[PDB]
């Protein structure tokens, strides 16, 4: 395996050699020396190894990685099996049984299956501490995830964007709306799913769009 998929690394290693970049890395590798990291190092960058840049067709902004065992690995809300759902994500396949009339839980929690249609399930932070929720955050991933959603905005065309929940919303605020489009909801933890994201049909919705970028859907039960 390689750390991080070759199509991604061509178009963004201008960022590893700013200050901000080797400060992060220098950050997390002491990090991992005193601390259980997650997710751990092959896995940080899996949302570049999953499709070609080039084949993006919908991006997901989430904001911190799972910080529980086993549970992150580099892509937003996904857990790989035998890891039951988190909330958040029984939440999505709630609004996925809704949205899609064919949409079954498939008895796991891996979003691989969407990344390899061009789902990039992003979060803006990339790793966390063990146990602690938003202990990595403003330590440097977010310019590097502001150059990723730059890079596509100005380099692709036609991208649905799903924003759920304020961080995701201001991490999105200078997307191109004459060039791609642009949904926005609430978060699905339960504690905001009722505001918004329950009913927000993004997924039907999402495929009607990508039809209209002259593209073809995404299969959301490939899974
Ligand atoms: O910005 C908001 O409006 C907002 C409002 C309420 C709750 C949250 C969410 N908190 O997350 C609960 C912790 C569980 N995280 C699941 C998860 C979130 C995520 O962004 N990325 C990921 O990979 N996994 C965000
Ligand atoms: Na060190």
């Known amino acids: ?10 178009h963004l290693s201008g960022e590893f050699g700013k200050p901000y970049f080797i400060k992060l890395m220098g950050f997390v590798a002491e990090e991992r020396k005193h601390y259980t990291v997650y997710p751990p190092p092959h896995q940080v ?12 067709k919908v991006v ?23 890891v039951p759902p988190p909330p958040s994500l029984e939440n999505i396949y709630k609004e996925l049984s809704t949205d899609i009339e064919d949409f079954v839980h498939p008895g796991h929690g891996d979003l691989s299956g969407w990344a390899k249609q061009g789902v990039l399930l992003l979060n803006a ?45 201001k991490k999105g605020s200078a997307i191109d709306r004459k060039r791609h489009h642009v949904l926005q909801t ?23 769009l990508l039809q209209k970028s002259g593209k073809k859907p995404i299969d959301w039960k490939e899974l």
């Open 1 to 10: 395996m390689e750390f991080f998929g070759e199509s991604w690394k061509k």
């Open 45 to 56: 960058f899996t949302w570049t190894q999953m499709c070609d840049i080039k084949d993006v």
């Open 60 to 82: 997901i902004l989430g904001q911190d990685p799972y910080h529980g065992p086993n549970q992150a690995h580099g892509l937003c809300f996904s857990v790989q099996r035998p």
């Open 125 to 169: 932070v990339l790793t966390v501490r063990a146990h602690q929720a938003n202990s990595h955050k403003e330590r440097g991933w977010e310019q590097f995830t502001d150059a990723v959603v730059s890079w596509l905005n100005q380099n692709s065309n036609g991208l649905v964007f799903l924003l759920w929940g304020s961080y995701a919303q």
């Open 186 to 208: 609430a978060h699905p933890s339960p504690l905001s799913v009722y505001r918004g994201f329950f009913g927000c049909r993004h997924f039907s919705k999402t495929n009607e």
